[PDB]
Structure 1
Amino acid sequence: MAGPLSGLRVVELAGIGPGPHAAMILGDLGADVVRIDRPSSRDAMLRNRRIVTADLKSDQGLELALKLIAKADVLIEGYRPGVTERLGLGPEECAKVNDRLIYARMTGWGQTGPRSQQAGHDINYISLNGILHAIGRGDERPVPPLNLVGDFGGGSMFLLVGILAALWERQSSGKGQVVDAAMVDGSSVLIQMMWAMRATGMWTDTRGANMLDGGAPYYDTYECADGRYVAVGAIEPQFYAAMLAGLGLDAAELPPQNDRARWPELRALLTEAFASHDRDHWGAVFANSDACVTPVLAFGEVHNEPHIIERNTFYEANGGWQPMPAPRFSRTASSQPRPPAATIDIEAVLTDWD
C-alpha cells in the first residue's frame, strides 16, 4: 500500500460527521483503514477503506470489535460523549486490550460542558465562537461557508493532527492516549489570525468591513460582462498597482488603496472596469501576472483549468472527478484512491492482521 502511513492500522466506528474525512485522509496516505458499519457504497468519502458489518449492541459484535481494536494503532469515533463508554468500547475498556491505541474522538462541542449532549452541525459550532458572524457582506445576514470551517478545517483536520501528534509521542513512551478533537476548539485555532489581529486593533467585529472579509475593494470578487466572476486578492501595493495597470486605470485618478473612507468610490471604479469584459478576458490578461486576479471557476469548469490538469489535482471516478490526496511526498508518494472494498467479513480481516 502506497504512501507515508503504510503500516498504520486504523479502526473507524461508522458515524456521520467529519470523522470519515479524517479516516479518508489517513487511508489516502496509505494507512490500513477498517470501518465497522452496522448491518442494514457510492459515497466517495468512503474510499481507501475496507468495510465490515458488526452490531455493536450485540455481545458478539463487541467482542469482534475489541479484537480489531486490539491489533491496531488508531481508533476514530464521532458519537456523542458517553456512547462508546456505554457500548463497552470507551477509552478505559480499549486501553485494557491495547495500551498502544490512539483513541480519537470527533465531536463538535467537546467531551464536557453544557452543550456536550446537544445535537448540532457545522453551522452551530462556528456560531458560538465568532467565526460565523464574520462571514458575509455587511448588509446581509451571515453566510455559512459550507461546512468547510467547522467539520473539516477546524474538525477532521485537527483530529488528524492530534492522531499523528500522538503517534509521535507513542514512539517515545510506548503508550497511546485519547485525542479530544472539538470543532469549536479547532475552528477557533483555525481563525487564530483574526483573534490576533483583533488585539492589535487590526480587525473589527463589523461584518464586511475588514481586509479579508470582502470589505476591501482589492480583496473581493467582481462581476464581469458575461455575469461570471473574477477574484481579486491584490493586498500588497505592488500587486495592486499591477492590477490597476491591467484594468487600464490610472492610479493618480483613484483614491488611495487603503483610504477606507473612499472604498465605496474605489469599488465603483473597479466594478465598472471589471464589468466591461467577460471573465475569460481577465483570466487571459492576468495570466502569468502578479495582479492577484483569477477567474472564479464553478466545480464543472475545474477539469478544464490548465494548472489543475497538469498537476493532477483531480482523478476520475464513477460519477466524475474527485481530488487526489494531499499533501504530496517526494519519496513515498500517495496513490490513486481505491473504491471502498465491498463488505469483508470482520473475521477475514482478523486473519489478515496477525
Structure 2
Amino acid sequence: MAGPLSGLRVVELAGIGPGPHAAMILGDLGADVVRIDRPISRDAMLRNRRIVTADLKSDQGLELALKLIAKADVLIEGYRPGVTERLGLGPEECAKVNDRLIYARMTGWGQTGPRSQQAGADINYISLNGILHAIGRGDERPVPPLNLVGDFGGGSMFLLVGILAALWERQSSGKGQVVDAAMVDGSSVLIQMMWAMRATGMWTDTRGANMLDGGAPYYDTYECADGRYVAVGAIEPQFYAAMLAGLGLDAAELPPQNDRARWPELRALLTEAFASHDRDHWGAVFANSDACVTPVLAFGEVHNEPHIIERNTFYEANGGWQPMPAPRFSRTASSQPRPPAATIDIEAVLTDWD
C-alpha cells in the first residue's frame, strides 16, 4: 500500500460518522486499517479497509479484538465513554497487552463532563460553542453547515491530528496514550479565528453582518440570469477592482468597497449586475482574473470543470465520483483508493500480521 502511513496498523471499532472518516483518511494515506463490525458494503466511506466481524460481548470476540489491538499501532473507537471500558476493551485493558497503542476516542461532548453521556449530533455540538449561531443570513434562523464542522472539520480531523501527533511523541517516549477528541472542542479551535476577531472588533456576535458570513457584498453569492449562482471572494481591494472591471462598473458611480453604511446600495448594484447574465458568462468574463469570481457548481457538475479534471481531485467508482486522497505527497504518493472488499476471516489477519 502506497503513501506515507504505509506500515501503520490501525484497528477501527465500527460506529458512525467521525470515527470511520478518520479511519478512512488513514487508509487513504497508506495505513493498513482493520475494522471490526457485528456479524460487500456499497458505502464508499469504507474504502481502504479490511472488514472483520466479531462479537465483543462474547468471551471469544473480546479475545480476538485484543489479539488485533496487540499487533496494532492505533485503535479508533467512537462510542459513549464507558462503553469500551465495560466490554473490557478500555484503555487500561489495551495497555496491559500493548502499551505502544495510540488509543483514539471520538465523541461529541468528550470523555468527562455533564453532557458526556447524552446523545447528540453535529448540530448540537456546534449549537453549544457559538458556531451554528453565526451561520446563516441574519433575517432567518441559523442554518446547519451540514455535518462539515463538528463531525469532520472539528471531529475526524482533530482525531487524525491527535493520532499522528501521539505517534510522533511515541517515536522517542516509546509509549502511546489516549486521545480525547471531542467535537465541541475541535470545532472551537477550528473557528478560533472568529474568537480572535471578536476581541479586536473584527467580528461580532450579530448574525449575517460580518465579513465572512455574507454580510459583506464582496464576500457572498449572487444569483445570475439563469437562476444559478456565482461566488464572490474579493476582499483584497485589487481583487475587488478586477471584479468591478469584469462587471463593467465604474468605481466612481459606486459606494466605496468598505462604506458599510451603503453596503445595501453596493449589494443592489452588484445584484443587478450579476443577474443580467447567466453563470457561465461570468466564468468566461473572469477567466484568468484575480477577481475572485467563480461559478457555484452543483455536485453533479463538478467532474466537468477543467481544474478538477486536470488535477484528478476525483475518481470514478460505483454509482459515480469520490474524492481522491488528500493531501498529496511528492515522494510517497497515495494511490487510487481500493473499494470496500467483502468480509475477511479475522484469524487470517492475525496471521497476516504474524
The TM-score with structure 1 as length reference comes to 0.99
Q: After TM superposition, give the deviation of residue 340 of structure 1 in Å.
A: 1.5
Q: After TM superposition, give the deviation of residue 341 of structure 1 in Å.
A: 2.5
Q: After TM superposition, give the deviation of residue 40 of structure 1 in Å.
A: 13
Aligned partners of 1:81 and 1:132: how far apart in 2?
25
> Hey, which bits of structure 1, 4+ residues long, moved more than 2 A?
none
Q: Is the 8 A contact 2:41 2:341 kept in 1?
A: no
Aligned partners of 1:180 and 1:288: how far apart in 2?
45
Q: After TM superposition, give the deviation of residue 29 of structure 1 in Å.
A: 0.3
Aligned partners of 1:279 and 1:62: how far apart in 2?
57
- Please say which of residues 37-46 and 85-94 is displaced more in the overlay: 37-46
Q: Is the 8 A contact 2:40 2:341 kept in 1?
A: no
CA offset digits 1:197-250 (Å, max 9, x no partner): 000011000000000000000000000000000000000000001100110110
Match in the other structure for 1:136: 136
Aligned partners of 1:34 and 1:309: how far apart in 2?
32
Q: After TM superposition, give the deviation of residue 17 of structure 1 in Å.
A: 2.4
Q: Is the 8 A contact 2:40 2:340 kept in 1?
A: no
Match in the other structure for 1:237: 237
CA offset digits 1:280-321 (Å, max 9, x no partner): 000111111000000000000001000000000000001101
Q: Which runs of 5+ in 2 are unaligned?
A: none
Aligned partners of 1:343 and 1:266: how far apart in 2?
59
User: How many pairs are equivalent?
Assistant: 354
Distance verdict in 2 for CA 1:74–1:264, change over 3 Å = same
Give the secondary structure class of the aligned counterpart of 1:222.
strand
Distance verdict in 2 for CA 1:40–1:292, change over 3 Å = closer
Q: Is the 8 A contact 2:40 2:342 kept in 1?
A: no
Q: After TM superposition, give the deviation of residue 85 of structure 1 in Å.
A: 0.2
Aligned partners of 1:159 and 1:40: how far apart in 2?
27
CA offset digits 1:309-353 (Å, max 9, x no partner): 000000000110100000000010000000112110100101010
Match in the other structure for 1:321: 321
CA offset digits 1:23-68 (Å, max 9, x no partner): 0000000000000001190110000000001000000000000000
CA offset digits 1:113-133 (Å, max 9, x no partner): 110011010000000000000
Q: Which runs of 5+ in 1 are unaligned?
A: none
Aligned partners of 2:138 and 2:251: how far apart in 1?
27
CA offset digits 1:183-206 (Å, max 9, x no partner): 000000000000000000110000
Aligned partners of 1:298 and 1:159: how far apart in 2?
29
Q: Is the 8 A contact 2:12 2:34 kept in 1?
A: yes
Aligned partners of 1:197 and 1:149: how far apart in 2?
19
Alpha-carbon RMSD across the aligned residues, in angstroms, is 0.8
Aligned partners of 1:104 and 1:25: how far apart in 2?
14
Aligned partners of 1:36 and 1:223: how far apart in 2?
47
Aligned partners of 1:246 and 1:337: how far apart in 2?
41
Q: Is the 8 A contact 2:69 2:98 kept in 1?
A: yes
Q: Is the 8 A contact 2:135 2:213 kept in 1?
A: yes
